[model samples]
Target: NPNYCFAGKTSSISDLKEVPRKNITLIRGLGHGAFGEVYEGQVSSPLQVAVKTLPEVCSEQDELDFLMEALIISKFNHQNIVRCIGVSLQSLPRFILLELMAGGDLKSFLRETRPRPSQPSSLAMLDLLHVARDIACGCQYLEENHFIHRDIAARNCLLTCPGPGRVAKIGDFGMARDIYRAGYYRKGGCAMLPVKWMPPEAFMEGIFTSKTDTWSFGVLLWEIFSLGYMPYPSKSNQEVLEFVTSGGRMDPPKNCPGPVYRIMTQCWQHQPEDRPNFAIILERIEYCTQDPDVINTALPIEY
Candidate 1:
């Protein structure tokens, strides 16, 4: 979802160095999408890695655009952001390598890691709180680094196995972009966007910014509360626009904590300026994590 631009048009694997092709091996295909295919792989040692490769039929321009995003994403190194190990461009069907996240993404992990239960499963509310904080911190890093992630959702947040060391990191950089002005990102013509996670300004004028990402994070919070239920289940993306523009918003999921729901509403403020920044979001989530009222309340089923 990166916008088309001359500055970003010329990019290569060498720009974001990782390991050479001679040292990497592809094990199996993880999944494939419009961007390309992801495979489970490893480096020279037994160290696991995820190798992303594009289809051979794409245009040269398409390849460059993909490489450019990888290059930019590689420049970012944060615990809450997925690490870009490197890329392979010496041959056809180039590869972009990343640290293997065995636990998959937040959405799938939340949905599949639990069983049928009326109350929160053993997935502790504390764990969900930390995950939310990690996501907010990651977004803060992106904002400080001068990038705007047009898409911010649980599906894009990668996770590792649960424990004290369990981690949540932002993964997909496809819809991310670098920007100078702190205001917004104007959309390129006719491209598809994640409408359920998008704000009203984006729907009406194609504007994206940290605030826009905050809006998506609000929807993401809903996703977490709903235990990965599809947002606006009955509405198509276009309908989402119409719904939001007409002053509609999602109600809190069953047993969603009051404090957390309050935070989500702040992110959905009608005006961009009214939405809380990631820093403020972190503060609010931290409070929610420690507040005895929320902690003692019956939580969602994700736990």
Candidate 2:
């Protein structure tokens, strides 16, 4: 049964490659992840990897949740989804080894390098379009596979590197499984939901489908164009929920192409069935990128 612990109902642990604990060297701490500490690590030979580990005092349920992410990620095969190198779950401080994303999370990168009045940005409109397209492709794959990514946002996306050839890959499965568990909430029994990115039905009726991911992708698009400004500005979770249910929508970020803004609005349709799926979204993003008029715009300039 232990072999099936990390595996979902359809797969077995045999599907995963087990890396020897000695083969991994935790070089240094990268930052804190949802579960615990993340690290820049070297895995056998010269291969660099990002390592995720749970807290030392975590409960047994926490360990299972952590390993579940490894299983889910292993099932995915896409350029825009982060690759799972292997896992080290034979001992304590179990590890999930991922391909090193040298450029870090997309949210931080966008905010840090946003164009200032005195300085120009290294990232162009086309680059952001590419990142958006990459995420759409990844989500399309997940949709085809009958998977729902409960959390889809810029903060959960990782960048391959800086400047030329940079790519965005969707990461983080922590929230994907959270919906199924009763322990998803904290002290107040209110689930810590991404209200800004969530579809109306998710918070109202406790519903989540692939269409919810589509809605979140729209917010992520806003984040990309706004250079990582938090969605809803100074609004509270309740306020956002009320605003969304009342048909209130945020305006397009300054300098955002009309075509791209229209796609975001389409994704925020009141009815889940009315919203475009990832496949259609991907196609629209491709069309935008192919049009020089749409992709050649400048970044927003704030006074």
Candidate 3:
């Protein structure tokens, strides 16, 4: 169990501990998520930055799995990717203390103010593109390094500051499958993961790849153009089974622009090779927004 709250901590620095007994100021539960409870907090000296944590009450194994992932993911130093600052596994139920996303995720921010559906208006296209570039850059790095993100959605990404001018950093890189053995239709003794952001290969045969992540990016692009909404409906696994098996896909919103919609369509195609790689995706975004002045502050960034 955690020894301190996000806003409350041990009386002295000496009492500061590691995961399972870490001296994290458990501020307040950030609220429940798909996987676990996250709390905003800070570590001890040499730990000059803030971080988020997974609670012990959640699945004990989930914390351990994330900790394992952090160890491998932390080395990826990209400006837009959340840095894995620290990890702890001192007790049976381990937890990771990671960089805090001050502006929170795109989903949380959008919940406060969503775009009106079936209507055209001023959307954060440039800002979304900037964040998307960061995400794609992060994905490209992971792909070159031989890893699969498994999950890639607005909710999983974090923005450091607000508005289009600020930067975003991709977070929660689930790598439980990569650090260990590989399996056919199953891997490293781990079961299949979530399907919403996955490509056809992942749903059809438990197959996962960098291209699968690219396909997910396509869906994310669609979401960006249409505002942050779930691209696919909450269908039964049986329906997901049928949709992915064939070439069916969630259609982009009617209000989405032509070029943006085209990019999304090209990405979700059945053939993986047809999907745009990260570099191509970057180029497309740049080309679509041909006006350099508009993209000056919203241009692509380095890690």
Tens digits of per-residue lDDT, candidate 2, 142-255, equal 888778888899999999997679889997877875543343443123446678898899888878789999999999999998888999899999999999999999899879
Worst 10 residues of 2 by lDDT: 1-10
Candidate 3: regions farther than 4 A off = 1-24, 33-36, 44-63, 91-95, 115-123, 175-192, 291-303
On a 0 to 100 scale, what is the lDDT of residue 41 in model 3? 68
Each candidate structure's TM-score, on Cα atoms with residue i matched to residue i, is 0.87, 0.93, 0.74
Q: RMSD of model 2, in Å?
A: 2.5
Best model number under lDDT:
2
Model 2 TM-score?
Answer: 0.93
lDDT for 222 in candidate 1 is: 90
lDDT of 1 by residue, 1-303 (tens): 233332335344445675677888889988874468889998884778888888888876566666666776677778998888777777767888888888888898878754357533556567778888889999998877656788899889888665456789998876664232123333333346677898998878877777988999999999887777899878887788888988888998777889999998999999999999998999999999989888776654442
Clashes of each: 2, 0, 9
What lDDT is reached at residue 218 by model 3? Answer: 84
1 or 3: which has the higher lDDT? 1
